[PDB]
Structure formats: structure tokens, C-alpha cells
């Protein structure tokens, strides 16, 4: 007479265990590890449809300088003025670099030309720089391999005494970011496992139960990581460091939460004197649908996040959903079997102590007696956090979000010790015409254009054919400043101050407008204008970020509402569940902004809110869903008593789960990628606020205030047919 699914799960537990173990072993043996797959299948950080990427590709194609947008810089630094031995070392290094052709596409020589000798010399003549163009776009495996090969080639020769060499640029920074992400992933896994061990031991006060929890969590994590690695091995999807870190941490935490829910329900059910079979059936029938709904909600939120335009969130989307689906399936199929097998052995999973049944009942009584002031105070507390909105300000450059011991940072510091910062990130402008510029009219036109460019405020230096620094000897510059066919010209732009702040980003439109105005009234009218550089690359991301955030955030609410409506079958309850979290977002945002920007003195990176909001909503909906599911069971005897009974019966479990999940997510502080620490801490405080105030003092108060209208369109009664005295 028992339900079919739990009976079949209980009967065939051992084959289920054996099949899961065999599948995990096969997945972990056949395919390589997750880190190697992630390294092989990195994704480019700039969309292929961006104007900057197309412009830079055109720059490379017209001048026969390859096709990739990557670039690297080699810096020579010494404590004494450079000498002839330095020149010999430089030319032999240049020859050795030019010997290779698979990775080094091209390079420009300026220090070897007496006409442009001052272009690379410092003010005090103690440093020099050379630009080399690599193969492959930024952030993908080809660029990383090329920069590693360049470093290997440049290191194999012993430098002359008194000088040292460094490699800078964006590609080296991205490679160092990848390596730091891998090491941070290892350290984070270790720290998270330690925290889980200590917290479970503190909560349950039994070593065997904690060992069982860790068994389930480890099996689930191994299964999900093996599945994702196998899926990514066959070129199906792309990957990145952020996706891997989020997947691992979120899978561990979700598995822990599901195990806590199941075993807490089992122990509570058994505490009333029921036998083992009755407790097993009770926990299954009371928690299966809740667990399935929570898992589907998280998966749907991640898939909705996958509807963006930036490559990072696009790669974030699918693997997270696949991992969550695998984790939920593994939990639902493996938890009950392990629990039954262990419980059949006499004494393994017996309860130890009663946690709390009186305090939560008193809290429920206080809520029922005075709902109004409680709701008003909770709303005021939610709003005071959002009050600090107008102080928000974001940051863009990743140079100061990384440890200073990386080779790229050391090279940047060495360059800045003698040179200005903006000299390391130049801009390239191309003007393309339809004829040849070998007559005085075109040179004077170029002079006028250069003067107009220099007239713009915020441009430190301009380099052109007529001004190489701020007849074969003159013919040598033609090969470097004009196309071989003589149909286009290019200019080099060096900003003043930081070339990465908002002013630098805004200067691109101004300089393009100035160039367009200078073109007007000249025979070169109708010419093509192209710009290339880092600031141009970041401008497109700055433009698209807000639209991507809005489109990703709008659909998640609708999907969550639909899922909750399906699960609970009542419009008002789902609306309340969504609205409480929507209101509570502001307190978390304000608290994170206050902690990070004002006190620590570090602004927020532009990738934080997009990943934070979706996870916050998806996780925070589950606690309200569980509370509503319990209240629906307990309401049959009356709303006023039902609220008290539900609060007493499901008070401590949600608290333990919330603290465990928040403390697991707060372990990102040890990471050496400060973006990871920011995301983890923000989620931590947000969920602490959600589990301390919103879950316990807003939803029950709203339910008690609304009464029977909370379950529209279903019909319920408040006083159930009063009975005479016994």
C-alpha cells in the first residue's frame, strides 16, 4: 500500500549504489581532469562582432601584420645607461625571435633605427620597449601558448650583467589570471572541505553522521565534475575559470543543503516514536517535491542567465545548469538508498538531542499576535540598506585586482618606474583613402589631421610620419607608417594619466569626431576611419553591460514565478515569495557596497552584480518555498495554529542550512582573485540577512495578515467547525 517510487528505491538500494560507483569510476578514468579541459577550451574575452575587433583585424590585414588582436611588449631595464653590449643582445634576441614563425607573427623595430632611436629611449635613457604581435585572440589557448613560447625563448639566453628583461601586455595578464585561478581553486576546495567538516561536527555532535554527510557530498561533487569534464571534452561547450569555480563551490554547497534537509526531516519524524520504515516514507513524501523544485529553480535561473551577449556569462550559463541537474538527480537517487542501508544496521543514524521546539513556537505566537509592527519594522530594515544607492561607482581595470608578484605586474611596475603608464597601452588610428599620398597636398593634409588630433584635451602624445618622436633614411619610415600599396596611413596615440578610467573611455568618441571633422573640407573626404586598442575594446563591453544585465534579470523572475506557481498551485503565495526576495536585494547590495567601497577603499568590479543577483534570488526562493510547503501541510487544523506548528517544526533546519551555505560561500576570501572574494562575501552577507530576517519575520507575518486570501484560488477555512468540550 506504500507509494511506488520509495518502495522501488528501498528495494534496489545496493544495485543503485553499485551503478553510481561504477559510473563515477568510468567517468573519472576515461576522460582527463577538469583543469586540462578548461585550459584547452578557453574562450575569447571580446565578441567577434565588436567594432574594435573588426577594426584591429583590418589593421593587421591591410598592412600584412597578421590577423590577431593580441600584442605583447618586451621591456629592457638597467641601472646604468644602455651600451653597445645591450645593442648586441637586443639584435641577437630580435633575430632569434624572428627565426620562429608559428607563434611570432610580426614585430616592429624602432630602437635599431637611428632616425627613430629616441622613440624607445627613456628620458634618462635607462629603459627600452619592443612590441611583438602574437597569433590568436586574447584569452584563448593560442595566445597563452604563444606568450609562453615567447617567455621561454627570451629566458633561454643569459642577459648581460646589470640589466633584466620583462614581458607585459594583456595576454600575459590573462595567462597569469588563468594560473592564479587554478591555484585558487585548489586552495578553495581544501578550505571549503575543512569548514564543512567543522560545521557539521559542531551541529550534529556525532562523528559517524558527519562522515556519512561527507560521503554523500564527495560522491556528488565527483559525479558532477566528471560529467562536466566529459561533456566539455567533445568540443560541445566552452569554459572559463569563473565557471569552474562557481560550479565546484555551488555543487558542494547544494549537496550539503540537500543532505541536511533530508536527514533533519528523518530525525524529526523518528523523534515522535515512529519506526524506521515510517520515518523513511515520511521524509521522502515530505521532501522529494521540495528538493526537485529547488533544483529546477536553480537550473532555470542559470539557463536564463545564459541569454546574454558577453562571452563570460554565455559560457557561465549551460555548464552550471548541467551541474545542478546532475547534482539534484544524484541526491534524489542516492540519499534515500544510503540512509536506508545505514539505518538498517541497528544504531548508526539514531537521534542524539532535541534542538529547539519551544523558542520557535514562542516566536510564532509573537508573530501571530502582532503582525503589523513586525512587518513594518522588517520593511524599514530592508529599505535602509537600499538607501545608500547614489554612492555606487564601478571600476574596470584588472591590473590592481591581482597579486603584485605576477610577472606582468612586475613588468608594469618596471616600465612605470621610468615611463608613463599610458605608454604601455597605445592606440592605433588608420585613415584609408582610394589613391596614393605621394604629393605635398596629402602630407599637408596628414599634418592638419595630426594637429587636430593633438588639439584634443587629454591626449599626451601623437606619433605620425612627420613627427616620429613627439632619401633611404626617410624612406625607411615609409615602410612602417604607410601601406606598401600607398592607400592608407596610421597614427599612434598615447594618453595622459590612466588610459583606462572613464575619461579615457569617453575620449575615443571625441577623438573620432575630431578626426571626422578634420577630414571634412579635404580631398580625402569619404575616407575610412578605424581605431584599435584596449580602451576601444572595453568601450563595447561598457556599452553592452547594462542591457545584458537587464535582459538576464528580467526573465529569471518570470521563470521562477512559473516554477513556484506549478509547485504550490496558488498565485498569491508565489507572488509573495518573489516579492520578498526582490525587496530584500537592496539590503544586501547596500551592505556589500558599504563594506567594500567605503571601508576597505576598493571599488567593485563590473562582473560582480550580474552573477550575484541570480544566485541570490535562486537560493533565497527555496527557503520560502520550503516554509510555504510545510505551512500547507500544517494549515489543516487552522491558520493560527498551523503557523505556530510549522514554525516550531521547521525552524532550526532552515537556520542550520542557511548558516552552512553562507559560511561555505564566505570562504572565497582566501582566494587570490579578489573578484571571487567580492562575489562570495556579497552572497554571504545577502543570505545571512535573508535567513535571519526575511524568512522568519516577513513571510509568516504576511500570511497571518492576509488570512484565507493567501491560497487563492483554492478555498480554505479559518475556523474549522468548532467542536464541543470533551
Amino acid at each position: 500500500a506504500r507509494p511506488f517510487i520509495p518502495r522501488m528505491i528501498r528495494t534496489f538500494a545496493v544495485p543503485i549504489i553499485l551503478g553510481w560507483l561504477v559510473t563515477i569510476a568510468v567517468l573519472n578514468v576515461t576522460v582527463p581532469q577538469l583543469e586540462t579541459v578548461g585550459q584547452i577550451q578557453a574562450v575569447s574575452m571580446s565578441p567577434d562582432a565588436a567594432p574594435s575587433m573588426i577594426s584591429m583585424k583590418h589593421i593587421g590585414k591591410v598592412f600584412e601584420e597578421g590577423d590577431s588582436d593580441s600584442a605583447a611588449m618586451i621591456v629592457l631595464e638597467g641601472q646604468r645607461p644602455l651600451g653597445d653590449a645591450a645593442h648586441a643582445f637586443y639584435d641577437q634576441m630580435i633575430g632569434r625571435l624572428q627565426a620562429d614563425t608559428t607563434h611570432v607573427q610580426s614585430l616592429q623595430d624602432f630602437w635599431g633605427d637611428p632616425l627613430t632611436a629616441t622613440g624607445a629611449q627613456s628620458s634618462d635613457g635607462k629603459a627600452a620597449y619592443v612590441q611583438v604581435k602574437l597569433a590568436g585572440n586574447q584569452g584563448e589557448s593560442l595566445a597563452n601558448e604563444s606568450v609562453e613560447a615567447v617567455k621561454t625563448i627570451v629566458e633561454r639566453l643569459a642577459p648581460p650583467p646589470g640589466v633584466k628583461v620583462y614581458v607585459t601586455g594583456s595576454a600575459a595578464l590573462v595567462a597569469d589570471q588563468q594560473q592564479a585561478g587554478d591555484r585558487s581553486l585548489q586552495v578553495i576546495e581544501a578550505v571549503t572541505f575543512t569548514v564543512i567538516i567543522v560545521m557539521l561536527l559542531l551541529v550534529y555532535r556525532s562523528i559517524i553522521t558527519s562522515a556519512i554527510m561527507l560521503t554523500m557530498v564527495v560522491l556528488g561533487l565527483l559525479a558532477t565534475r566528471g560529467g562536466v569534464a566529459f561533456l566539455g571534452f567533445h568540443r560541445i561547450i566552452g569554459l572559463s575559470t569563473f565557471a569552474t569555480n562557481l560550479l565546484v563551490v555551488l555543487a558542494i554547497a547544494a549537496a550539503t543543503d540537500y543532505a541536511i534537509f533530508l536527514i533533519g526531516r528523518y530525525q524529526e519524524a523518528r523523534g515522535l516514536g515512529q519506526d524506521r520504515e515510517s520515518a523513511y516514507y515520511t521524509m521522502f513524501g515530505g521532501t522529494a517535491h521540495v528538493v526537485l523544485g529547488s533544483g529546477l529553480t536553480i537550473a532555470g535561473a542559470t539557463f536564463c542567465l545564459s541569454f546574454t551577449r558577453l562571452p563570460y556569462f554565455q559560457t557561465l550559463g549551460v555548464p552550471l545548469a548541467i551541474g545542478m541537474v546532475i547534482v539534484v538527480a544524484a541526491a534524489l537517487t542516492l540519499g534515500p538508498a544510503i540512509i536506508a542501508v545505514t539505518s538498517r544496521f541497528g544504531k548508526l543514524l539514531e537521534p542524539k538531542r532535541m534542538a529547539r521546539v519551544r523558542g520557535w513556537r514562542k516566536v510564532g505566537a509573537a508573530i501571530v499576535r502582532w503582525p503589523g509592527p513586525i512587518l513594518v519594522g522588517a520593511v524599514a530594515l530592508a529599505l535602509v540598506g537600499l538607501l545608500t544607492l547614489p554612492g555606487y561607482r564601478t571600476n574596470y581595470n584588472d591590473r590592481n585586482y591581482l597579486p603584485a608578484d605576477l610577472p606582468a605586474n612586475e613588468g608594469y611596475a618596471a616600465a612605470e618606474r621610468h615611463f608613463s603608464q599610458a605608454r604601455m597601452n597605445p592606440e592605433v588610428l588608420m585613415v584609408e583613402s582610394d589613391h596614393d599620398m605621394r604629393n605635398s597636398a596629402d602630407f599637408l593634409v596628414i599634418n592638419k589631421i595630426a594637429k587636430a588630433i593633438f588639439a584634443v584635451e587629454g591626449i599626451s602624445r601623437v606619433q605620425a610620419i612627420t613627427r616620429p618622436d613627439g632619401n633611404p633614411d626617410f624612406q625607411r619610415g615609409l615602410e612602417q607608417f604607410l601601406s606598401p600599396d600607398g592607400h592608407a596611413v596610421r597614427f599612434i596615440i598615447s594618453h595622459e594619466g590612466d588610459p583606462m578610467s572613464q575619461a579615457g573611455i569617453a575620449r575615443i568618441a571625441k577623438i573620432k569626431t575630431a578626426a571626422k571633422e578634420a577630414i571634412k573640407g579635404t580631398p580625402l573626404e569619404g575616407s575610412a576611419i578605424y581605431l584599435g586598442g584596449t580602451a576601444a575594446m572595453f568601450k563595447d563591453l561598457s556599452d553592452g553591460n547594462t542591457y545584458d544585465l537587464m535582459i538576464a534579470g528580467i526573465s529569471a523572475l518570470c521563470l521562477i514565478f512559473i516554477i513556484m506557481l506549478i509547485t504550490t498551485r496558488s498565485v498569491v503565495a508565489a507572488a509573495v515569495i518573489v516579492g520578498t526576495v526582490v525587496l530584500s536585494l537592496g539590503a544586501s547590495f547596500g551592505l556589500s557596497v558599504l563594506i567594500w567601497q567605503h571601508i576597505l577603499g576598493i571599488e567593485l568590479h563590473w562582473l560582480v552584480l550580474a552573477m550575484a543577483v541570480i544566485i541570490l534570488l535562486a537560493v533565497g526562493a527555496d527557503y520560502n518555498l520550503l516554509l510555504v510547503a510545510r505551512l500547507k501541510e500544517e494549515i489543516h487544523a487552522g491558520i493560527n495554529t498551523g503557523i505556530i506548528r510549522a514554525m516550531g517544526g521547521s525552524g532550526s533546519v532552515v537556520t542550520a542550512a542557511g548558516l552552512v551555505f553562507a559560511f561555505t560561500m564566505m570562504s572565497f576570501a582566501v582566494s587570490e582573485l579578489t573578484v571571487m572574494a567580492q562575489v562570495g562575501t556579497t552572497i554571504g552577507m545577502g543570505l545571512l540577512f535573508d535567513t535571519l530576517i526575511v524568512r522568519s519575520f516577513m513571510t509568516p507575518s504576511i500570511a497571518a495578515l492576509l488570512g484565507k486570501w493567501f491560497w487563492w484560488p483554492q478555498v480554505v477555512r479559518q475556523r474549522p467547525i468548532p467542536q464541543p468540550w470533551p
Partner: protein, 84 residues
């Protein structure tokens, strides 16, 4: 109508459900706070539970001065038997 024994039995069941005290240890002479060790929130719980199951409206204003069980049952029978 309602006799003393029925009201006492119902109240004892409510007390046993709420605070866990055995129903055989409640008499009208005993006191809620001095002897039975019952807090104000427990009184609110008792009032809510007895309002839902059977139906009696006891405002907190005159509930504050309600101390023993004898006055409780006297109030209950006054409200019930004397139908307004």
C-alpha cells in the same frame, strides 16, 4: 451545557501539548506563573489554541489579570453558558 470536568480535561490536554506537563498534575487551585511555570507567550499560545479548536475570545486586557485555572474555567463557563 459545559461542566467543570470537560473544560479541565480540554485545558489539561492543551497544557500537555504546549509545555509537556502531565495532565494529571493540574488543579484549579494551582497558579500558572508561580507554580505551573507558564510565560506570557505560553498564555498567548493557549488562548490561540483554545480559540481555534473550540472557540472563545479572550482579549489580552482582561487576560493579563487571569492568574489561576479556577478563574479561567469560571470565565469560560460564564461566557459559554450565558449565551449573549
Amino acid at each position: 451545557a459545559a461542566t467543570q470536568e470537560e473544560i479541565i480535561a480540554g485545558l489539561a490536554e492543551i497544557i500537555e501539548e504546549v509545555t509537556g506537563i502531565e495532565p494529571s498534575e493540574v488543579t484549579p487551585e494551582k497558579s500558572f506563573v508561580d507554580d505551573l511555570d507558564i510565560d506570557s507567550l505560553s498564555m498567548v499560545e493557549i488562548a490561540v489554541q483554545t480559540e481555534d479548536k473550540y472557540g472563545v475570545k479572550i482579549p489580552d486586557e482582561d487576560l493579563a489579570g487571569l492568574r489561576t485555572v479556577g478563574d479561567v474555567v469560571a470565565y469560560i463557563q460564564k461566557l459559554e453558558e450565558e449565551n449573549p
